[PDB]
Amino acid sequence: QKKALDLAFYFDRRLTPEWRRYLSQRLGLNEEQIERWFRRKEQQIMVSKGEELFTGVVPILVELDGDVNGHKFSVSGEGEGDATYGKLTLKLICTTGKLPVPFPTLVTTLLQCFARYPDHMKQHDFFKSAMPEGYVQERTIFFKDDGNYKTRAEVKFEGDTLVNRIELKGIDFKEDGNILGHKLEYNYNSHNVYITADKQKNGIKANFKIRHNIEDGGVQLADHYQQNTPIGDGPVLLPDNHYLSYQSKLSKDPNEKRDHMVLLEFVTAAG
Amino acid sequence: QKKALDLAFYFDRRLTPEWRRYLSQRLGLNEEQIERWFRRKEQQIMVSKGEELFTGVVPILVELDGDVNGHKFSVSGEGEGDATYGKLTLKLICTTGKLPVPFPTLVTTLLQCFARYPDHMKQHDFFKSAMPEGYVQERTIFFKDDGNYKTRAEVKFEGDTLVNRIELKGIDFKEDGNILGHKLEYNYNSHNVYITADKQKNGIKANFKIRHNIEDGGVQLADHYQQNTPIGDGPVLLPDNHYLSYQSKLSKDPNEKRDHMVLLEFVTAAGI
């Protein structure tokens, strides 16, 4: 009755059919009850681990390799994430010269592991649970009446640092359109992103529309379709339906002559 | 000093490169040290885990399904291991009438997890570390101037019962030879079996000779070649070189009508 369950867990958390049956017949407890106890303890540990890895300020490195209608560019970033306050701070610099797209179209692409999940729903935070091996984030971004972005991001710890390498491809863009023609305002609205579980891929998915302000009136729609998949083998947290509430501020560094964006975001989960 | 490792280990026992590199930088320790610390932990745990799983008296079920030279036969048995005393006791009945080989030629085939490892050697006990998922035990047995056995067995827990399930194939056997002709004494010689790690297969191997007494004089050699491989994905204990000392007593159950063998083995690990 209990007690030995702790010991069993300490010995071996790989609840295989054989380990389950063994513990069943050996404790009188039935298999489902053992399954439930194990999954429960696993969750609590998954929660405590994520809290540990994301306590305090976490240094961030970002590398984005881009190609939009053959126009190639690189963007590198650094800054920090403070999940306690749902705070993400980044300075992103285009290193190849002039960014051929407007920076706000890259805002969604440029680390949801930094969201502030309230205590009562920390067991729904997939993004942290994937650490340190990380997760792959893929998105397709459809700009209405214009082309599309496809992105592939790999978010993981490399040592003490949270790293994000991204590859981006954009095709079918209008050279005189809102994107390649630089007709979008340098600002950002608040949005809610709805997260659901992607169980057949052991992760999560989301879709959401960003509204970009066209200069002197009008909106450029950007329709986002997103999928996240764990990279490693460990257990992860699969969330019930919830959402992330975003605020973003875009600014500049007065001393940085290179084409760049300063990004501040606050992210809080549906609690 | 650093109880961080313990907490890290509590959190996540899968020391991937990412987990390793992370823990290294956050704690300021080198990757090797962490690898080492985690390894020493897992070993202590496997040792404790084995002890718990074999602590008092464990029931055993054996089921053998065999065909030597067309002659198909079934042996089934039960008993109990008491690894604390290195002891094993089985009553093995041939469920299909009469056995077409001598029971002594099946002794090695018909549970090395019930060996007694002395405390200073328990980290070398592969057989227990593989439980409860178990291991596959394969052997070829060459009977000099005669046929050969080929065996594959699975030794795994099913509930709290240790189970040995075996397939046996014997070919090229002389019809009036020592085996099919039934010319072997009903007894068994004591000796040592030398274990080595088989790192490639994540398990162990051993070869050894059994000398079976031919009736009225002489000896029938049975050269054993053996390999064991985990069934599960869990970690296992890979031993340094050592041996198991065997003593076997074959007997009969007076009130038992069926063609059978009562086997009792004492098994103790040694070397260092």
Strand partners for A260: A93
| Cβ-defined contact of B18 to A232 (cutoff 8 Å) | yes
The packing angle between helices B17-27 and B4-11, to 10°, is 160
H-only helix segments in chain A: 4-11, 17-27, 31-53, 126-129
**Nearest CA to CA, how far is B156 from chain A (Å)?**
8
Residues of A in contact with B156 (CB under 8 A): 18
Chain B contact present for A157, CB below 8 A: yes
Class in CATH terms, B54-270: mainly beta
Secondary structure (DSSP) of A171-209: ES--TTSTTTTT-B-S----EEEEEEEEGGGTEEEEEEE
DSSP label at residue A264 = E
Chain B residues close to A24, C-beta within 8 Å: 159
Phi, psi for residue B24 in degrees, rounded to 5: -55, -55
Establish if A41 touches chain B: CB-CB under 8 angstroms: no
Distance in Å, alpha carbon of B116 to nearest chain A alpha carbon: 21
Contact check, Cβ <8 Å, A7/B160: no
Interchain contact, A12 vs B234, CB within 8 Å: yes
For residue A190, how many other CB atoms are within 10 A of its CB?
A: 9
Q: How far is CA A167 from CA A72, A110, A170, B150, in A?
A: 11, 11, 10, 55
User: Which regions of A51-159 does DSSP assign to beta strands (E)?
Assistant: 58-68, 71-82, 87-94, 135-143, 148-158
Residues contacting A83, CB < 8 A, separation 6+: A54, A58, A113, A114, A115, A116, A128
Q: How far apart are CA B30 and CA B24, in angstroms?
A: 5
Q: What is the DSSP letter of A232?
A: S
In terms of DSSP bridges, do strands B135-143 and B87-94 run parallel, antiparallel, or are they unpaired? unpaired
Contacts for B180 with CB less than 8 Å, ≥ 6 apart: B68, B69, B100, B101, B173, B174
Considering CB atoms only, which of A22, A45, A160 is closest to B157? A22
Task: Please state, in angstroms and rounded to a whole number, the distance separating the CA atoms of residues B94 and B116.
Answer: 28
3-state secondary structure of B41: helix
* Contact criterion met (CB below 8 Å) for B62 and B81: no
**Measured CA distances, B135 to A142, B138, B245 (Å):** 53, 10, 21
Pull the structure tokens for residue A79. Answer: 């800054």
A and B: number of Cβ contacts within 8 A: 72
Q: List the single residue in A with minimal CA-CA distance to B234.
A: A14
How far is residue A79 CA from its own chain's centroid?
16
- Backbone angles phi and psi of A44, in degrees to 5: -60, -40
B265 and B248 in contact (C-beta within 8 Å)?
yes
Measured on CA atoms in the order B120, B123, B125, B129, is the torsion positive or negative? positive
Chain B residues within 8 A of A49 when measuring between CB atoms: 11-12
Method for this entry: X-ray
Q: Which of A52, A159, A232 sits opposite B11 (nearest CB)?
A: A52
Helix or strand or coil: residue A241? coil
- CATH class assigned to A54-269: mainly beta
Q: How many other β-carbons are positioned within 10 Å of the β-carbon of residue A40? A: 11
> Which contacts (CB < 8 Å, 24+ apart) does range B5-12 have?
B5/B34, B5/B37, B5/B38, B7/A52, B9/B38, B9/B41, B10/A45, B11/A45, B11/A48, B11/A49, B11/A52, B12/A49, B12/A234
DSSP bridge pairs for A60: A79, A162
